[PDB]
């Protein structure tokens with residue numbers, strides 16, 4: 001109700017113009033119209049000399065019934081006006097083409113979208129530094145706002161850091177005129193699954209949630225039939241309203257003019273589909289479309305009631321490349337802290353000379369390890385961390401595939417890191433260590449610069465040891481953090497000191513109890529929040545084996561008491577399912593200091609002095625276990641020393657198929673059951689996956705293939721998935737039986753899969769999933785594959801897949817199924833190949 005363009009978008013669906021390319025390419029402006037010999041061919045040079053010609057292109061879409069019009073602003077930026085010195089006065093031009101667009105639109109009332117391009121220079125590939133783009137956007141955009149546009153479009157953006165500096169620049173441009181508006185970023189896309197920079201469709205939206213921009217959208221995409229996947233994930237998933245502008249397919253240059261072949265009738269179908277089915281709040285197509293496209297869309301599709309989108313995006317964070325969900329509640333998020341020179345010293349060996357190529361290895365090795373947010377701190381004696389942080393992020397921001405956390409000390413890095421990082425991060429600036437003043441500005445920086453914080457229970461006083469003062473952390477910060485400083489519970493972690501218990505003092509001995517009772521007392525009221533604990537530090541000032549075991553049983557009760565994330569190094573925990581029965585009883589009553597009969601601490605230490613060979617390279621009691629348990633335990637701890645030899649022993653006893661029917665389905669499944677019960681954590685499940693992954697590569701060559709030319713079969717996972725364990729075997733028994741095969745990767749969004757249909761023209765296509773949300777994606781595939789008129793065999797499965805939300809799909813598509821096992825997958829391939837008795841009905 002506060003803004004006319006949101007009154008429009010919330011009510012009903014409206015249409016954007018075509019662009020002025022194919023339209024200025026049809027006016028035959030001749031070089032005197034550039035006003036100078038050196039200003040060749042420059043739109044945004046014409047705005048000075050020939051206002052009447054661009055007014056002619058403006059009014060053409062207005063006569064053809066458009067409802068949103070771009071200003072000319074494709075060049076409104078210093079570093080692209082000056083590209084051949086073509087006039088430094090951006091503001092002028094911006095108030096010029098905004099006035100030219102208003103002069104045309106005023107009788108019609110169609111919305112003036114101050115509508116930029118992306119500029120010629122990118123932040124994220126290091127073509128330019130943030131100040132030189134932020135300056136250009138900052139000075140330009142205030143002339144558009146002075147020009148009285150109904151909103152700004154930062155449209156066609158090519159990089160999320162280019163979005164960030166453009167949004168910061170547009171905000172500081174509008175705010176220094178005393179205003180703000182429902183501004184609209186919109187993003188390009190490429191068939192690689194991504195923007196041009198490598199940003200995927202999840203990273204785009206997960207980043208764009210962090211921003212007050214009430215509208216988001218797409219632009220300069222390659223046509224509706226290629227935009228559909230992207231428009232999907234945006235329209236059904238986002239809170240902020242979505243809009244659509246395909247460039248009419250793909251270009252073809254004639255006589256120096258770009259021209260297309262998508263028709264006004266076809267663009268009427270595609271918006272008629274998208275607007276009521278998916279809910280797209282505004283529509284059009286700009287580059288490559290005449291005024292007839294927008295007319296034929298306006299008559300068919302304009303004024304339809306704009307459909308609602310959901311009240312919440314999940315708990316999320318985003319790198320350049322990919323999103324991550326912030327709340328796991330199973331396989332709790334692991335946070336990597338090895339990028340630390342102040343709470344650790346590994347970082348300090350590699351980063352000392354300024355060797356940035358070395359700090360990136362220390363970042364990426366923690367993801368392979370298992371941690372999917374990294375925590376960074378370069379602070380040290382006799383070194384300026386805020387200058388170091390210039391150098392540090394110049395490598396990390398475009399190298400690391402996972403989001404960031406920031407243990408670095410000065411809140412001035414809170415600003416400089418948020419001026420060199422893409423996406424959405426978190427920061428450990430809420431250490432309440434310099435008091436409430438410093439905290440409220442830290443919580444403001446968290447969002448004034450997009451999105452970045454973690455609560456830490458350090459404070460002006462120090463490390464909360466008594467719980468009343470510890471829950472008074474959450475009382476001081478959280479409420480004003482979410483409800484005065486913008487980051488949701490689902491945008492934050494929460495962290496409790498994890499101080500040493502094991503020094504043996506009657507101060508220290510109980511303290512893991514303090515953390516578990518608090519943690520619980522805190523999830524007690526923190527739903528959605530990823531509780532994050534620095535597990536490594538509970539066991540400090542004692543022998544290292546008692547560090548693995550106490551850290552382990554602390555962490556693995558912490559999930560049951562309410563944990564969802566942890567700051568970890570996987571070398572300094574083990575799983576609670578491994579722990580010897582006496583050692584587990586010891587470790588619990590040590591975590592409680594529930595002492596009777598003997599003291600738990602010196603009982604513990606003397607337990608490890610008595611049981612030295614148990615939690616080591618055990619030459620006997622572990623070896624004496626039956627191989628199915630031994631493999632179960634290798635899958636639980638991630639034991640690999642002799643893993644090759646125990647799988648060789650299993651393969652000596654039984655055939656691979658009998659082994660994969662056995663422990664290489666069953667023992668994993670038991671690890672999965674124990675994992676669902678909380679008896680394990682992410683890096684141990686990653687050790688289980690790595691065990692399988694390795695094992696399948698040893699099982700497949702002995703289970704050797706036969707036959708040739710049997711058919712063409714491709715396989716495909718689904719959007720939002722990370723698993724491909726099932727997938728691999730779902731494929732494998734089909735790959736073993738003479739069919740030509742192509743494999744699609746772990747997370748493939750659908751237009752890549754359908755391009756593989758269109759290019760390969762196979763006899764069969766795999767679909768797949770190992771988790772619940774694959775089912776929801778199955779229906780999204782099948783409903784639209786039908787709307788495109790496909791008839792190809794696509795096969796459907798997954799740990800989760802179940803006939804109850806699958807046989808009903810037979811209605812939507814003529815190829816619904818559930819091979820459960822890849823041996824049925826082969827029997828079903830032979831049916832749809834015509835080799836076997838089709839019985840599928």
Ligand code: B12
Pocket residue numbers: 327328329330331332333668671672673675676682685686688689720721722723724725726727729730766767768769770771772773795796797798799800817818819820821822825
């Ligand atoms: C190993 C594992 C992981 C691995 C996966 C790596 C990998 N590449 O596989 C990793 C550690 C990366 C992982 C990640 C996650 N996981 Co996980 N994972 C597991 C686990 C233990 C085993 C999965 C397994 O491999 N099963 C064995 C394979 C062989 O069996 P299958 O998948 O069922 O395959 C059979 C049939 O399903 C069929 N089939 C499967 N696909 C298809 C397709 C077609 C077309 C056909 C006809 C047949 C078919 O064929 C096979 C028989 O041959 C499961 C537990 C479980 N219940 O299985 C959880 C589990 C799937 N994970 C879970 C969760 C919680 C997560 C994460 C959210 C954890 C996190 N990061 O916080 C993420 C998800 C990340 C993401 N973006 O997707 C939950 C999901 C529950 C839910 N309802 O959402 C599960 C079910 C466990 C649980 N109980 O919490 N996990």
Ligand SMILES: [Zn+2]
Pocket residue numbers: 019156219220247286287
């Ligand atoms: Zn465009």
